[PDB]
Ligand binder design. Structure first.
Ligand code: HEM
Length: 152
């Protein structure tokens, strides 16, 4: 549950991501894969990437980064009213991709990390607080659908 002031901060921060969605998307995925290598195993089309250099050089990884952040942005722009947008994502990630909720925690923190890295001194305390709450909300609503499906 976010205030309007907090949503405003979220969408303000998101404006940064939208100026370069592929660059941000790329760095988030790289931060995830290198920070948590077990996550790489869930991707049959990235599992070949052994080195971070190969990750950085991968246009298909950048492509998928765009897909992921485009979807997250669509959801964020709903300001919490994202049931229709979120349900198919929860369903595919539980039933097809088999992504435990722990990995959504991983990518959440990675987004926070990337924003500080790309915008040092430009991602203030209030902005981080708002973005973190927004990602917690996202995660929590996925978690509810996971529970429904009995997925661990
Ligand atoms: C902000 C969080 C995330 C968002 C918004 C997101 C979004 C998406 C979207 C839109 C797709 C393509 C449509 C679909 O299959 O449902 C997708 C595919 C996929 N996602 Fe996610 N995702 C997120 C997190 C994760 C995480 C943390 C993992 C694994 C650690 C993951 C694993 C996958 C895999 C394996 C696919 C299919 C890739 C392929 O073979 O094309 N996702 N995701």
């Amino acid at each position: 549950g976010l205030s309007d002031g907090e949503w405003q901060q979220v969408l303000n921060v998101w404006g940064k991501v939208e100026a370069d969605i592929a660059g941000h998307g790329q760095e988030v995925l790289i931060r995830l894969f290198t920070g948590h290598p077990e996550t790489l195993e869930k991707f049959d089309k990235f599992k070949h990437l052994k080195t971070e250099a190969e990750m950085k050089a991968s246009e298909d990884l950048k492509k998928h980064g765009t897909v992921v952040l485009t979807a997250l942005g669509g959801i964020l722009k709903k300001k919490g009213h994202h049931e229709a947008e979120l349900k198919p994502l929860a369903q595919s990630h539980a039933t097809k991709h088999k992504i435990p909720i722990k990995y959504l925690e991983f990518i959440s923190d990675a987004i926070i990390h990337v924003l500080h890295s790309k915008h040092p001194g430009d991602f203030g305390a209030d902005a981080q607080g708002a973005m973190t709450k927004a990602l917690e909300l996202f995660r929590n609503d996925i978690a509810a659908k996971y529970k429904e499906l009995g997925f661990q």
